[model samples]
Target: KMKRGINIGNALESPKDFPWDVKMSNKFFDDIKDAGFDTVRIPVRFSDYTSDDNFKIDEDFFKKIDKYVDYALDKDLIVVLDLHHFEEIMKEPRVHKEKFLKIWQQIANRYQKYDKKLVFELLNEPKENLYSQLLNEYIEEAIKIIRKTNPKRTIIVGPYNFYQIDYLNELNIPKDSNIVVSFHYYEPNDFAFQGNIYHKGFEHLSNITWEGTNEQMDYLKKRFDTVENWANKNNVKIFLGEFGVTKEAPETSRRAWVKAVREEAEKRNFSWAYWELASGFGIYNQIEGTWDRDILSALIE
Candidate 1:
């Protein structure tokens, strides 16, 4: 699998009525490919655009995704499409199991014929470790539906607990050769989540740096070893699906964190997609049409 990537977030997955304000462009992807990323993750909120009971996605929505997928692949970048932020099913897995499976079935059936450069991620950051069993069951059924048409396409799965490393042990990986289990990393959320609305309490602290001190660096190494150990035992690839700080973070601080984590992730031979491309955690400022050299350097250099 290709090594570096970024998420195209907050555009498609926003609620249908949410008025996401931003739209994707071929030039956006062109910039990503030119900037040296090897993959792009396009997360879709299938539940939002699809019917409540039938799980039928609006044809235009799927086609829009189709166009974006084509754009990414055309740039020779690997593409990962997943059901993201499907909150209804995420919280109530059993009640929405059939609908979730149907969504994957339609997605798989729609793009099953795409080349190997395309990947299908089952779900993004499942929030409940309490329902780990149910989440695994949901993933198992989704994988089965995908395999009906795409036996060789790689699938990305992550443990519950919202991508925390502690719960990685809970993932019930299937007996499939092309699985790439993924997880997100944002340790010491007090620092990284400092200004993001999704986080609480630390919204006011705006200059925290992830200095690669002995203690901080060692902590990251310790956490990564857990995933490395699991991959060694299970013989599956690990993908760091998302990791980056918000724009409110100081540039140097952001660089330090990105450098520290990116170095460690690469050292452990993990493939990763930075938290986003053109939003809060974006490395590239789409409006300016330029990449943040410091942040980008931290990631890929």
Candidate 2:
């Protein structure tokens, strides 16, 4: 159902929305629908509200998310609730295994009644110590927990190593028809993340440009094909969960890369979402209440 989508990032994913400056708004749902997009992927950091021992997601936070989900559904937009930035589990999977599975149980139970339009993305970018073996164990368990309540709801899962396409084979997906595979694309990170000093180690890296040369285009297409081949062999659906270029990059190059990725995903019949709505790699301008027309058209049109 997710033909075209955009991520509402840096808001709920942040420890607090005030500093991120992108709180959930009812109007944004309308804006998204009116903008001709079909879906909105929301990344939330539920760990911030849960305790290490109990693993109870705060009721207030859960209700807050419910309101936003209600808003999106009211506008007839498909919503993907993504469990994002659960860093502790990534660093110490064994230690946080119970807590992680418990959190999913609570979330799955809460949203079980929701229809297929509301998807559950298990986790975002499992990195650090969460390798293939440990991540596979967690993924299987989380799916089983979620399936207890959300039997038919679509569940999206990604591999470790930041969900890089190269690591797709390492992921051990369950044999379930309702499951969808997800991956983020920021190949040639120098171009996609250029000028974003906050990313750490990329501080001094600026002014890098991606002209979308024939060779570069070929490389990305080949990388994407790898995922498509895997999905075809496994008989599962694919979702391009995240992809974008930072605003610091050259305007022309940024649009080119975004458009290239979007077009390639569409050509492969894979559903996709931009990395974010308003933040470092934003398409819509929160302050101006307008979209970057060039990037917007590149993504949708």
Top-TM-score structure, candidate number:
2
The TM-scores, one per candidate, come to 0.96, 0.97
Give the residue spans of candidate 1 off by over 4 A: none
Model 2 residue 116 lDDT? 71
Give one digit per residue, the lDDT tens place, for model 2 in 1-301: 8889999988898874344757667777888889999999999998888865678888988899999998898788999999899988888889988988888999988888886799999889999999999899889988988888888899999988899888999898796889989999998888888878657666567788889889999999999889999999988889999999888889998999899999999999899999889888988877667899999999987
Candidate 1 lands at a TM-score of: 0.96
Pairs with steric clashes in candidate 1 = none
* Residue 113 lDDT, candidate 2, scale 0-100: 88
Cα lDDT, all candidates: 0.84, 0.88
- Measured over all alpha carbons after superposition, the RMSD of each candidate to the real structure, in angstroms, is 1.4, 1.3
**Lowest summed lDDT over 10 consecutive residues: which window, candidate 1?**
17-26
lDDT of 1 by residue, 1-301 (tens): 6699888887788888884635777888899888888998887887888777577889988888888899889889999887788787666667888887888888888888888999988888888532688888888888888898999999999988887788888888897998998989988787788877656676677667776788988898999999999889889889999898888887777888888898888999999989888887777777778988888998877
